[PDB]
Design a protein around this ligand. Sequence first.
Ligand SMILES: Nc1ccn([C@@H]2O[C@H](COP(=O)(O)O)[C@@H](O)[C@H]2O)c(=O)n1
Length: 335
Amino acid sequence: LPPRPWITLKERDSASFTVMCYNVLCDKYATRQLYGYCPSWALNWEYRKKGIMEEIVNCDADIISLQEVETEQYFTLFLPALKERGYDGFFSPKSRAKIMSEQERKHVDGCAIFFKTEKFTLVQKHTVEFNQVAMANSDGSEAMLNRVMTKDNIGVAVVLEVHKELFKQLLIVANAHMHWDPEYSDVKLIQTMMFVSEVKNILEKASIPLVLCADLNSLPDSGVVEYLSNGGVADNHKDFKELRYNECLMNFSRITHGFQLKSAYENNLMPYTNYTFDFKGVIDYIFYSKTHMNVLGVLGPLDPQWLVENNITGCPHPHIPSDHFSLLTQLELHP
Ligand SMILES: Nc1ccn([C@@H]2O[C@H](COP(=O)(O)O)[C@@H](O)[C@H]2O)c(=O)n1
């Protein structure tokens, strides 16, 4: 497996730091039924976690956003190992409000944000529960209650002090993992607007640059990517499927947001971020405040001719420990 190439897009000169975004594929979902093309010994977590930790250590990012972090693995694998690489972290599982056994609680996955303490100091941490926010804004929309409220997905966000020696400067890093089902573009879009409007509220109770990492489960042509990329979306966008023109959506505000985000990866520089037999596409993203930061570089994709040479039609694989590829970008923050 050849190393992935680092790409220089723009020359330095402010502070520069790297951000990784990575869905590690949790053990619960790494099954023969979903990934029958991958041998069971290569799906097993005691094997796969080595490649996952290797990928994270090699990327060596100043800030790390992970999805599908299982609760117990956060406390016994990721955080203890990354603490030795100079990180602290913030984790939150999905499904905190759901009743379940002690054993099941250990295996619920969530989102984690790690940051190197020599460069950042955590000032606030927050968990955004999409089901609670949907429920609180569901008046007059059966679809909000039936379709959006019933999905357990979350995002997390931290407010960080960017240390002066990298140049009281603050940055917000947000990390979310949206509902997956392709028949539910309305849920994905509403979850995205809910997350962005709740992050905006985090600002006020604290303008400030944003780095938004997420497994959006949304292709680049989607309503969520347009919403994140153009600062808003019409309320009658087709991804709402009806109720398009519903008034409850304006609570998250045409529905607009004041951020001015661009994607760190822009022109299918990676042709996909999720790579399985049945589905290949870009559904993972790193967005940043374009009026505050430049992109100085990104980590290019795994050489596709190698995947071709080795007849690899889906991941994970004995030498690729997730069905997602990591995203890694170096940003340059300007006061
Ligand atoms: N537009 C989209 C986005 C995701 N998906 C499905 O969701 C899967 C991704 O799941 P996760 O991102 O939650 O791991 C894909 O492999 C695919 O089966 C889809 O079928 N259509």
